[PDB]
Design a protein around this ligand. Structure first.
Ligand SMILES: CCCCCCCCCCC[C@H](O)CC(=O)SCCNC(=O)CCNC(=O)[C@H](O)C(C)(C)COP(=O)(O)O
Ligand code: SF4
Ligand code: SF4
Ligand code: FES
Ligand SMILES: [Zn+2]
Lengths: 118, 83, 687, 231, 114, 47, 83, 198
């Protein structure tokens, strides 16, 4: 038989994350925009949640960038806004969702460019 | 000093690295070595620089030497050609 | 009604009559490979790379230019429509110079990918290629135009989005070169967009010539702080220094475009930048020292000085979070002399109702306007992506633009009513001709620039405009949600400052000189040390050493909008969040914390210790700050007028003139801009 | 990646020609020595059904008499056009497994012979520039090839979304990759089945009633390399 | 809601298991400090056990608790059946790492991002 | 090399060196990129 | 009690705020005319009941809830604040 | 273009129906890839029953377990997708039975059905955190003895949070929070253009 729990699945205790990176890390759920350089829209389809950016100090010996934040390069991809919000809640990371913004329909017709008076 | 004017300041400590050691640099600097090669006086408006050696060179590109004032320079070799 | 049903591969999508074949595929979700078709640019049909095959039809049709018709099935992936792409891509590539490892639009090429996805694997062009002489179109755009696929999107943008109408096609055949016939530089704001809009890497950015390659660039989405339109932008950072800022689309604010200033002044962000907290030494020179010592220099003076002896002249690019941390601090020593450098008239209701100081007809409401009364501002150089708005709505719709300022280049046909603030009274009386024009307008909008307000009779100019808006509203009988009066700003931290109750103008500091002054990012000359009391103890809180630094007893370096999760708000009150693209440099710290820390070293210790808390703070003083991307609908214009009617002031005959008369005026304004080597190169090119 | 140099097949013939004597030589030195047989015979016997149940799948499967070679059963590549005999052992002691491994070396010389005798003239990589990178001369003279070289090296093949478990008879046993693929150029999951994760599990059962010394033989007869097990 | 029970039907039954594990660890701390020649005090170690057992005191859900002890039991097994040598155990004490202050002023003085 | 001498290209070395690792001639790695964030130097003239 | 600022965080189109907004429409102008320096801030919250925040001297802020209060009660509460 | 025989896509398809019919209480979906591979999908409760039928049925003997793995689709409510690939030396065919398990909803163990799974199930617990009831001895296999966190989860940082160095002061190896000297450069590689309808 099933048991009842109203407790938001929080599994922060099982994930195995250091305390500092669960209480000081804000992740943003956003649908990636399109670099204006290209006109393809296949990278503006799935929602992604990305952890907040952290220190990137220069390395003294070779000048390479060095980072102390483990969750930096991690960007998880989630198909829908609801599912991504769920991941933040059970993992205990703070979230600030940004609504998808899709190009509004635009009316175009080759005839217009040859308008008597535009 | 180096190709890009990389010279540790008089106070920087990476200079400790060079203490008792040679800071590796090359006397032969490209910015200068290309200059020596003379401008090729081709007689066609557009010429191609395959890079020298064909497959053993750089991607083939055609240069427009039409501008009378300036000389075409292969984005790859740096070789210059004038009409 | 008005809903044809067309099938895209038998999906029965339904589209308004008028939708093109390419558009029909988009709603199903398919994407026609396309070049020369941009959503906000006119259809041209030059490339013919979009040929698709409507069912039961002899020839393939041009997607981007074919009005869809009832019943048609698109057959986008039909064997035919693939030969119609496998054979076009054969041609674009045939005359193309293969210098893809030179073309810095390497991974940002809509022609390799559309070739790797929709084209063939080889080549049959055993013949020779062509070469086109390059052009020095400007100091920002590098036109290696041997790359050009003659797609004419530049010639469109340069005519349709921006009103330059300079770039054009020259010649016919395979040596049609799309470059200026005579070598005249493409000098205009909105110029850099050509880079972003040319899918080929023929003309690309000259500063960001070869510093990076796109796969590496980590892309953080943030907000434009150089201008008050608050254009959305994406800061591309590699290994921790910003490499490029390119637009990201916001339908309402910047729809895929950004100004020349806010994409080539990322270089200014990297020099003359403050990093360590220096203090004035006995000798009289600023000496770098640890925070602890620099902060207690300031804290000790703060404890000694009482209210109205401590003042803050904030201004420029400071965020809302610092602005509330500076007010909460100076009130905990009871001086409410917090002020901003840009004077907004505050004798009637100012700062109290939130419509006296906002462009409340939305940036997207310029599209549905009828007559715009530009009064005393050059939008072209004060809000370039709002000038574009009136550009599009004068072209695609029919806005009748009228300017009461200097006759100035506006990229559109305006009516120059005159250069006199009192003729505003002329229209209010109904004496001037355009009085009827407005009478004829069902949805009119006045726009009073902040720079007109910055003159001495600015209080009178606002009152005079409010009177005219009042009877314009009465005569037109315009509906309540249509809002005629709006005023646009040119300083990013002005709407936020006025929102948090900061009182505009340094007039209050002028009448009583503070023993102490926190210049929170102020590089303006609003008060100078000669003007200050003998002590002249002032501490600069900012990012670049420009005017406030060398006259500063303490330097507390801060960050810039590329380097903090702060909030800003543009002119119609849409609050927006900058995200940290790069960690702040040196010992430099986030603006809000420096002030929280100074407070803890002083004993009045601001209650907020984590950003989320500083925000919750913003919520108690003001609503917009916490709700992002959300314009505030209602306003109270009627009570604003009543107080305007009480105010009596004289508009002096001196013509109202925008400070940015021509584009050299525009390139260098704020600190980051001034510190720009690219902006400096642009300035000398004009001069 | 690249065509065989013009002298390799002659040199592979000379090695294969004389290699069998070399197997014959350790054959004499370590196959009848009473000391080897005693150390190897009747040690780590694994019964046929137990071998299938423990997922042994290798010489360990064949040594106890189960007849399974992914090279003949499910012929990958050309293993359908080469003739060889799987060396099935009978009883399962570590000797029968050794003898099988020595036979597979001999049977592989039979397969290597056929490959040198019948290798076709042709190209070494599929001609789809979308999947295999364009030739050095072509990328330096044709634009379609530079674009295909640039995209393939910088971004990738972008394999179509799907998932597959492909097993080949690696010398240790069945080596399989379960590659789950989104449409992206980089994989989503790649479970390397290691012939060896299963074999090492069998050590406790196989090394039953055995001395400290027998365990050294038991690991040796599983041919376990910890790279595959640890992955 | 409507979840299936892993091993404990309710926080009550689950807590029973936690008690057992605590006891287990409590009885084990001394042995480890001797079989690993660790340079710690049994009392000290036993407090650490308490620390951990409470670090996760907030969990209210029965299922999460049950896994927590499964995992906890596994750790004990690695320390009583000794497969975890000193380096592994002492890591719990975070002996070498320099502690970071949590005071705002402290962080301000040291790190860009707190 | 005697029979078919190699190609000389007026940059190639004439004295080739062995492992210089223990000897002072050894490579010591260094970043060759110049400074990135130039700083505002304080005015040396007392205000 | 030195009064420095009063913030009326009304919430537009909210049932309770009706009284607050009515006050703004009918009496705001008057209050300002009377106190022509004090900054009375009309701001617009959301999904929050209206709050008449008041900032007294030396950084003390005080709160009076205006949820579901009549137009004159809002007027009376405002008048009580600037004593 | 690879050669494809539809003989298999038909044989395997039919078998799929056969399995489904015989085990309808658990089989949710049964598909054959375009690559001629069957992939019965079963409710997690059908782990024991569906495997056993395949291990011991005359018309479907699937004696050895090729592999047990768990893809992790973070979006999917049930995060893990335990996949069991089986081989039938009798019928020379492989099938894959895949179930779904969330982080704290354990799956049954099949060590009974195939003892091969004794190790792989420990591997799935160590890397992904799924738990297997009735497992003889479930304990970390691949990770370090004191490792905290399940590594192959998509939400775990590649570099991880701890790294080891020898400290003289304490004369013993000691974890420290990871500090990397050149962070993993995260090249963005997806192209903004799709390839086909799929
Ligand atoms: C010296 C070597 C140090 C090694 C210490 C030890 O091995 C590590 C370890 O504690 S292993 C993890 C223990 N963690 C649990 O066993 C879960 C506890 N579960 C709860 O705490 C619940 O929240 C509950 C409702 C029971 C609160 O109730 P209560 O506060 O315990 O009474
Ligand atoms: S544009 Fe630049 S990148 Fe795109 S193909 Fe032509 S050269 Fe290669
Ligand atoms: S320049 Fe860029 S945009 Fe203008 S035509 Fe050539 S390609 Fe099309
Ligand atoms: S997009 Fe169809 S014509 Fe260029
Ligand atoms: Zn060249």
């Amino acid at each position: 038989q099933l048991i009842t729990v109203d407790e938001k699945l929080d599994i922060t205790t099982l994930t195995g994350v250091p305390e500092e990176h669960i209480k000081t890390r804000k992740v943003r759920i956003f649908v990636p925009a399109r670099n204006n350089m290209q006109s393809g829209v296949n990278n503006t389809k799935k929602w992604k949640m990305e952890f907040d950016t952290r220190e990137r100090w220069e390395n003294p010996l070779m000048g390479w960038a060095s980072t102390a934040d483990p969750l930096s390069n991690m960007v998880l991809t989630f198909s829908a806004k609801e599912d991504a919000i769920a991941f933040a809640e059970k993992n205990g990371w703070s979230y600030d969702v940004e609504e998808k913004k899709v190009p509004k329909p635009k009316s175009k017709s080759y005839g217009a460019n040859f308008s008597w008076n535009k | 000093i180096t190709h890009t004017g990389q010279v540790y300041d008089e106070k920087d400590y990476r200079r400790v690295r060079f203490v008792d050691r040679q800071k590796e640099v090359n006397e032969n600097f490209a910015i200068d070595l290309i200059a020596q090669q003379p401008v090729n006086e081709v007689e066609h408006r557009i010429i191609a620089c395959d890079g020298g050696g064909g497959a053993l060179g750089h991607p083939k590109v055609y240069i427009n030497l039409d501008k009378e004032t300036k000389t075409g320079t292969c984005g790859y070799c740096g070789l210059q050609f004038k009409q | 009604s008005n809903l044809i049903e067309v099938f895209v591969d038998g999906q029965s999508v339904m589209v308004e009559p008028g939708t093109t074949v390419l558009q029909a595929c988009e709603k199903v979700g398919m994407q026609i490979p396309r070049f020369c078709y941009h959503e906000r640019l006119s259809v041209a049909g030059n490339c013919r790379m979009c040929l698709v095959e409507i069912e039961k039809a002899p020839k393939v049709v041009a997607a981007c230019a074919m009005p869809v018709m009832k019943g048609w099935n698109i057959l986008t992936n039909s064997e035919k429509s693939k030969k119609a792409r496998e054979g076009v891509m054969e041609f674009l590539l045939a005359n193309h110079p293969l210098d893809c490892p030179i073309c810095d639009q390497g991974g940002e090429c809509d022609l390799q990918d559309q070739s790797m996805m929709f084209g063939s694997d080889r080549s049959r062009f055993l013949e020779g290629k062509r070469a086109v002489e390059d052009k020095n179109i400007g100091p920002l755009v590098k036109t290696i135009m041997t790359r050009c696929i003659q797609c004419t999107r530049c010639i469109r943008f340069a005519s349709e989005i921006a009103g330059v109408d300079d770039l054009g096609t020259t010649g016919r055949g395979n040596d049609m070169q799309v470059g200026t016939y005579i070598e005249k530089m493409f000098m205009s704001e909105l110029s850099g967009n050509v880079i972003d809009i040319c899918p080929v890497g023929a003309l690309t950015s000259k500063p960001y010539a070869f510093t990076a390659r796109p796969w590496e660039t980590r892309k953080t989405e943030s907000i434009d702080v150089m201008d008050a339109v608050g254009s959305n932008i994406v800061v591309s950072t590699r290994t921790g220094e910003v490499m490029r800022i390119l637009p990201r689309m916001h339908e309402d604010i910047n729809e895929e475009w950004i100004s020349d200033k806010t994409r080539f002044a990322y270089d200014g962000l990297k020099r003359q930048r403050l990093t360590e907290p220096m203090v004035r030494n006995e000798k009289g020179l600023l000496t770098y020292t640890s925070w602890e010592d620099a902060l207690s220099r300031v804290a000790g003076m703060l404890q000694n000085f009482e209210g109205n002896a401590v003042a803050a002249i904030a201004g420029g690019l400071v965020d809302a979070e610092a602005l509330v941390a500076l007010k909460d601090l100076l009130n905990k020593v009871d001086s409410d002399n917090l002020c901003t450098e840009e004077i907004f008239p505050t004798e009637g209701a100012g700062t109290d109702l939130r419509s006296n100081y906002l462009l409340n007809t939305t940036i997207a409401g310029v599209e549905e306007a009828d007559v715009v009364l530009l009064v005393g501002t050059n939008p072209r150089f004060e809000a370039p992506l709002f000038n574009a708005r009136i550009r599009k709505s004068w072209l695609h719709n029919d806005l009748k633009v009228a300017l009461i300022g200097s006759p100035v280049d506006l990229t559109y046909r305006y009516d120059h009513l005159g250069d006199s603030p009192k003729i505003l009274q002329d229209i209010a009386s109904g004496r001037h001709s355009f009085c009827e024009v407005l009478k004829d307008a069902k949805k009119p909008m006045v726009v009073l620039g902040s720079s007109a307000l910055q003159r001495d009779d600015g209080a009178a100019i606002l009152v005079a405009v409010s009177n005219m808006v009042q009877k314009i509203r009465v005569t037109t009988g315009v509906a309540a949600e249509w809002k005629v009066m709006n005023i646009l700003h040119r300083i990013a931290s002005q709407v936020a400052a006025l929102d948090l109750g900061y009182k505009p103008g340094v007039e209050a500091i002028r009448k009583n000189p503070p023993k102490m002054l926190f210049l929170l990012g102020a590089d303006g000359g609003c008060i100078t040390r000669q003007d200050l009391p003998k002590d002249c103890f002032i501490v600069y809180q900012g990012h670049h050493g420009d005017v406030g630094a060398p006259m500063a007893d303490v330097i507390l370096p801060g960050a810039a909008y590329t380097e903090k999760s702060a909030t800003y708000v543009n002119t119609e009150g849409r609050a927006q969040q900058t995200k940290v693209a790069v960690t702040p440099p040196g010992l430099a710290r986030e603006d809000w914390k420096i002030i929280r820390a100074l407070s803890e070293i002083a004993g009045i210790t601001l209650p907020y210790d984590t950003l989320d808390q500083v925000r919750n703070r913003l919520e108690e003083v003001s609503p917009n700050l916490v709700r992002y991307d959300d314009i505030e609908e209602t306003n109270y214009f009627q009570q604003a007028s009543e107080l305007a009617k009480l105010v009596n002031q004289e508009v002096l005959a001196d013509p109202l003139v925008p400070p940015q008369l021509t584009i050299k005026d525009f390139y260098m304004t704020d600190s980051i801009s001034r510190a720009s080597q690219t902006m400096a190169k642009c300035v000398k090119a004009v001069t | 990646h690249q065509d065989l140099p013009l002298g390799l097949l002659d040199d592979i013939y000379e090695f294969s020609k004389n290699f069998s004597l070399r197997i014959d030589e350790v054959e004499e030195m370590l196959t009848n020595n009473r000391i080897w047989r005693n150390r190897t015979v009747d040690i780590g016997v694994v019964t046929a059904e137990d071998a299938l149940n423990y997922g042994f799948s290798g010489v360990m499967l064949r040594g106890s008499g189960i007849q399974w070679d992914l090279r003949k059963t499910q012929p990958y590549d050309v293993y359908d056009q080469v003739e060889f005999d799987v060396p099935i052992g009978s009883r399962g002691d570590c000797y029968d497994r050794y003898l099988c491994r020595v036979e597979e070396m001999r049977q592989s010389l039979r397969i290597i012979e056929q490959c040198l005798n019948k290798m076709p003239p042709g190209e070494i990589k599929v001609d789809d520039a979308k999947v295999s990178p364009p030739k050095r001369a072509e990328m330096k003279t044709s634009m379609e090839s530079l674009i295909h070289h640039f995209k393939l090296y910088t971004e990738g093949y972008q394999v179509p979304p799907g998932a597959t478990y492909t097993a080949i008879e690696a010398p240790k046993g069945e080596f399989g990759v379960y590659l789950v693929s989104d449409g992206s150029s980089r994989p989503y999951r790649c479970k390397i089945k290691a012939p060896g994760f299963a074999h090492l599990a069998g050590l406790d059962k196989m090394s039953k009633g055995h001395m400290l010394a027998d365990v050294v033989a038991i690991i040796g007869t599983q041919d376990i390399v910890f790279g595959e097990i640890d992955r | 809601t409507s979840v299936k029970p892993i091993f404990s039907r309710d926080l009550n039954e689950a807590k029973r298991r936690v008690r057992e594990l605590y006891r287990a660890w409590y009885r084990e701390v001394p042995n480890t400090v001797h079989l690993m020649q660790l340079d710690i005090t049994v009392k000290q170690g036993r407090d650490k056990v308490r620390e951990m057992f409470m670090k996760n005191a907030h969990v209210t859900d029965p299922r999460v608790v049950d896994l927590l002890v499964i995992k906890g039991k596994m750790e004990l097994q690695e320390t009583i059946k000794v497969w975890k040598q000193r380096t592994h155990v002492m890591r719990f004490f975070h002996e070498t790492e320099t502690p970071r202050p949590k005071d705002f002023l402290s962080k301000f003085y040291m790190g860009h991002d707190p | 090399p005697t029979t078919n001498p190699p190609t000389a290209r007026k940059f190639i070395w004439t004295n080739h060196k062995f492992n210089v690792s223990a000897t002072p001639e050894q490579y010591v790695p260094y970043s060759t990129t110049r400074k990135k964030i130039h700083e505002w130097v304080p005015p040396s003239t007392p205000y | 009690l030195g009064l420095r600022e009063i913030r009326v965080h009304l919430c537009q189109r909210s049932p309770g705020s009706q009284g607050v907004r009515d006050f703004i429409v009918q009496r705001y102008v008057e209050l300002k005319k009377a106190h022509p320096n004090l900054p009375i801030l009309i701001r617009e919250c959301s999904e929050v009941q209206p709050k008449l925040w008041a900032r007294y001297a030396f950084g003390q802020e005080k709160t009076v809830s205006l949820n579901n209060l009549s137009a004159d009660e809002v007027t009376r509460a405002m008048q009580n604040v600037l004593s | 273009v690879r050669p494809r025989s539809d003989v298999t896509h038909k044989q395997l398809s039919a078998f799929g129906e056969y399995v489904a019919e015989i085990l309808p209480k658990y089989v949710q979906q049964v598909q054959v890839s375009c690559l001629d591979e069957l992939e019965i999908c079963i409710h997690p409760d059908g782990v024991i029953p569906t495997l056993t039928f395949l291990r011991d049925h005359t018309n479907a003997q699937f004696k050895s377990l090729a592999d047990l793995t768990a893809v992790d689709v973070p979006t999917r409510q049930n995060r893990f997708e335990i996949v069991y690939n089986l081989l039938s030396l009798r019928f020379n065919s492989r099938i894959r039975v895949k179930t779904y398990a969330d982080e704290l909803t354990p799956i049954d163990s099949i060590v009974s059905v195939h003892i091969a799974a004794n190790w792989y199930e420990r591997e799935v617990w160590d890397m992904f955190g799924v738990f297997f009831f009735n497992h003889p001895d479930l304990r970390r296999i691949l990770t370090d003895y004191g490792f905290e966190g399940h590594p192959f989860r998509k939400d775990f940082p590649l570099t991880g949070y701890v790294e080891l160095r020898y400290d003289d002061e304490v004369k013993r190896v000691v974890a420290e929070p990871v500090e990397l000297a050149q962070e993993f450069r995260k090249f963005d590689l997806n192209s903004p253009w799709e390839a086909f309808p799929a």
